[PDB]
Scaffold this active site. Sequence first.
Site, mmCIF file in Angstrom:
data_model
loop_
_atom_site.group_PDB
_atom_site.id
_atom_site.type_symbol
_atom_site.label_atom_id
_atom_site.label_comp_id
_atom_site.label_asym_id
_atom_site.label_seq_id
_atom_site.Cartn_x
_atom_site.Cartn_y
_atom_site.Cartn_z
ATOM 1 N N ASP A 138 17.906 -10.348 8.167
ATOM 2 C CA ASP A 138 18.735 -11.141 8.740
ATOM 3 C C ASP A 138 19.731 -11.564 7.740
ATOM 4 O O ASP A 138 19.555 -11.619 6.314
ATOM 5 C CB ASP A 138 18.205 -12.628 8.861
ATOM 6 C CG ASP A 138 18.944 -13.853 9.538
ATOM 7 O OD1 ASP A 138 19.863 -13.363 10.038
ATOM 8 O OD2 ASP A 138 18.469 -14.922 9.282
ATOM 9 N N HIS A 173 16.879 -12.585 12.133
ATOM 10 C CA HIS A 173 17.132 -13.938 12.459
ATOM 11 C C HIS A 173 15.986 -14.424 13.439
ATOM 12 O O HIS A 173 15.591 -15.621 13.164
ATOM 13 C CB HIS A 173 18.402 -14.372 12.889
ATOM 14 C CG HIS A 173 18.839 -15.754 12.855
ATOM 15 N ND1 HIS A 173 19.178 -16.179 11.513
ATOM 16 C CD2 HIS A 173 19.192 -16.697 13.562
ATOM 17 C CE1 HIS A 173 19.406 -17.568 11.743
ATOM 18 N NE2 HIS A 173 19.388 -17.805 13.058
ATOM 19 N N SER A 210 16.496 -21.308 11.894
ATOM 20 C CA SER A 210 17.905 -21.661 11.466
ATOM 21 C C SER A 210 18.392 -22.977 11.090
ATOM 22 O O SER A 210 17.530 -23.464 10.116
ATOM 23 C CB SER A 210 18.913 -21.169 12.482
ATOM 24 O OG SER A 210 19.950 -20.600 11.895
#
Lengths: 415, 415
Positions: free
Chosen positions: A334, A391, A152
């Site tokens: 995601d 994610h 991320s």
Amino acid sequence: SRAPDQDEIQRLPGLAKQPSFRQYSGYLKGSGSKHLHYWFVESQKDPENSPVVLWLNGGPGCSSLDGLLTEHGPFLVQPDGVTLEYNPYSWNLIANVLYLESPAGVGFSYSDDKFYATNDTEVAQSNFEALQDFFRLFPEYKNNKLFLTGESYAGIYIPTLAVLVMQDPSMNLQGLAVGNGLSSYEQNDNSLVYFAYYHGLLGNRLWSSLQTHCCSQNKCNFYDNKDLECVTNLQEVARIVGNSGLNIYNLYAPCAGGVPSDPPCTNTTAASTYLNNPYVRKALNIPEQLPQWDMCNFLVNLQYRRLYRSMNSQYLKLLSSQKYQILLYNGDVDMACNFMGDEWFVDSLNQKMEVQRRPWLVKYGDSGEQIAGFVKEFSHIAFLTIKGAGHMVPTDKPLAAFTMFSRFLNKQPYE
Amino acid sequence: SRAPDQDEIQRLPGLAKQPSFRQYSGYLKGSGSKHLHYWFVESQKDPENSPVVLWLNGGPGCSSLDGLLTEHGPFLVQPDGVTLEYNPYSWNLIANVLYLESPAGVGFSYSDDKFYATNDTEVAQSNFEALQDFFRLFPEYKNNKLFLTGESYAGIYIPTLAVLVMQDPSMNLQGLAVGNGLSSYEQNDNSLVYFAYYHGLLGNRLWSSLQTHCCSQNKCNFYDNKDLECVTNLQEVARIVGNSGLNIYNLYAPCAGGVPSDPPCTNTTAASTYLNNPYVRKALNIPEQLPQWDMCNFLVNLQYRRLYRSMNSQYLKLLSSQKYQILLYNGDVDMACNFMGDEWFVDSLNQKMEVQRRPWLVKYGDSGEQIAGFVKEFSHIAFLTIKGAGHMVPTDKPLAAFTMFSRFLNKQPYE
Ligand SMILES: *[C@@H]1O[C@H](CO)[C@@H](O[C@@H]2O[C@H](CO)[C@@H](O)[C@H](O)[C@H]2NC(C)=O)[C@H](O)[C@H]1NC(C)=O
Ligand SMILES: *[C@@H]1O[C@H](CO)[C@@H](O[C@@H]2O[C@H](CO)[C@@H](O)[C@H](O)[C@H]2NC(C)=O)[C@H](O)[C@H]1NC(C)=O
Ligand SMILES: *[C@@H]1O[C@H](CO)[C@@H](O[C@@H]2O[C@H](CO)[C@@H](O)[C@H](O)[C@H]2NC(C)=O)[C@H](O)[C@H]1NC(C)=O
Ligand SMILES: *[C@@H]1O[C@H](CO)[C@@H](O[C@@H]2O[C@H](CO)[C@@H](O)[C@H](O)[C@H]2NC(C)=O)[C@H](O)[C@H]1NC(C)=O
């Protein structure tokens, strides 16, 4: 041996069987008065010659210990928040993995002055100093192949840190990998709107309104458009995507707690219950005076000053030497850092030795070879999708994530 | 009572508990010498006043018994191909469900002349005659609310049959529902190419080639484009989508048998093993001379003459009376008859009382209310997505499918 005996993890609560590998938990010195909590897990196979892999979670303000306990660590926390079960897809099966809680104030990391307001440049310099401290504490690992990995917001942490590491000849940097990473705000914002419409989350009326207010000919601006009605339409897209009951981290997963009347749709209770146990803190050599462990530090996030808008320059700098292998991998379901934004980003680097896009395979025992996703390869850089993963790729698809990781470490084709 | 005693199912093999409802298996007379095998399962709650629901699977050439045994029947076939387990999400919990193997030659259906070459108009007329025969055999069900439902190619079977049923006042037609249905070849083909790119199956080079060879300004023709290079590019899209190891019926599901060197990626062994058991055939009143049961009749498909290119005229005819409630529902991860093609189709009907697109909810016990998909409603017609479901919505999401079905039968809002 040359490792710090003081940082050794003797008997970790919740484990039914003692580990076959050595593990350490202590502090790495960052910049100023910063003390970054690390949890180092040696390779289950040949730790002396196995690569050293740094793992960073994002946020900014989120803990890399969630990566250990819920994604790819040697053992994963169970729903009771007490039991740990061995992970057959652990990244430490083939690497010495360094999980670093960063920046200061995240999880068990802290500063003597307790001032946690930071920025991208300070974080990169503090991580570099922490890595130098790691090599002073574990000198036996100085010559091992070094890989910098993360998820991320670590899409910013990793390339900025890698640019500092590249300038240090004593560190044996060999590559970097970023999972569902933020590489460009513009690419992420633009691709997300297309992702939302084509995944059936926006109606034709809203799509028509977005096309008329945000677009001109065959080019859409869903990033920094000043048109007031475009902003209003994009506020509706953001509401549907992340504030309506859909799980932003995995479109096809349920929303923990149900559709509303810890970030939305997530539940960090198991990892929090485990890490906040006083015997676990003692086993991890955590000073008693430190505040409770949280998956994400709300205050670190609130005070964080984002500086870089794109990692284009960083990746071009890292690719210039042709000494490092780079991987950007994204779970394709995601919505936080969607796969398309990162595929567009890798393609935009315009590297040589472009290969035709191909599926990559994973053998699922008796079920045979299955398409685990797609790979777009160039010289020293590859973009991969992980089909059906969100994610947190190693949580959703642990075998595919391990397989990809193994091929990355060994500089093998992803197919 | 007035039902045919000869068609009663006494003791169905593989069931551990006897059914609380009456069930029948026999033959309905179609056109000419056609004998269509039916399996009628009465409602588990108040069969006398519950609606009569016809269920048709598609292909063309595929069996509606697969709908019973693998999708929404009262009991589902287990992997051993011997055991049947009760389905807590069965559509017969609230309806008298008529599963019809159609056209002639499909499954246990047959003709005295064994000539199975047919077309859309003949199939609709034969289904209408079979429905008339059902009401002659079960006169107690003549006044019950009648709903016509189906999947895939039944996107053609159902509206064409409904146009014939509408002209018969003795049949109490109240509505129709089509799951992942073929409504327009043009809408399906165009939307599929966008679906493939936006689900990360096509690379930027292939997308650029498709845009240059198939498109002009802001309009793409991926349906009947004569451009030779556009045809070649679309052949590559078709290869990636259905002939490369991806499951065309559910993008995120594995490919049964593995990635190649029964249609591709499917496995009908359980239902085939069960239905081909001689004691099961005897229990279902199947004549001994009939050939083996197959999920899809390859020869019916090969000889089938497709006549209609769009159901636009049929749906407009059905909506003209304002007497019927129509539902088109699509699992959003199906690539055979993708959700977007059907959403575009419903919107193109340009009906009155257009409502804003909204999520629809399902309560998952302790997990609470969850977004099951999205609903786009107009007067007498609604389009629904089933989030995370493939081609066979009741197989992938049984609770969401039942909930949607219950709201449809009771003419309640889908939200
Ligand atoms: C959030 O996560 C916690 C931790 O996994 C869940 O609590 C567990 O629930 C199961 C089932 O009821 C129990 O067996 C565990 O003992 C519970 N663990 C703890 C630490 O209490 C909780 O249910 C989840 N909440 C939501 C809304 O999903
Ligand atoms: C990012 O953070 C660093 C570290 O706090 C900032 O640099 C410091 O800025 C203060 C105030 O100007 C100086 O007193 C320090 O000497 C600086 N330290 C270093 C190492 O340069 C930096 O200004 C911040 N960047 C932005 C754009 O906010
Ligand atoms: C295709 O489906 C059949 C039927 O479900 C599978 O066969 C079963 O396999 C399991 C596990 O090995 C056994 O317990 C069952 O008894 C088998 N059933 C029958 C009827 O043989 C088969 O494995 C599937 N094939 C593929 C390639 O997925
Ligand atoms: C669709 O099938 C029907 C039924 O076979 C066809 O209609 C028959 O056509 C033959 C040959 O022309 C005639 O001998 C029959 O009398 C017709 N029957 C009926 C009920 O009309 C029909 O032509 C086919 N349609 C197409 C376009 O192929």
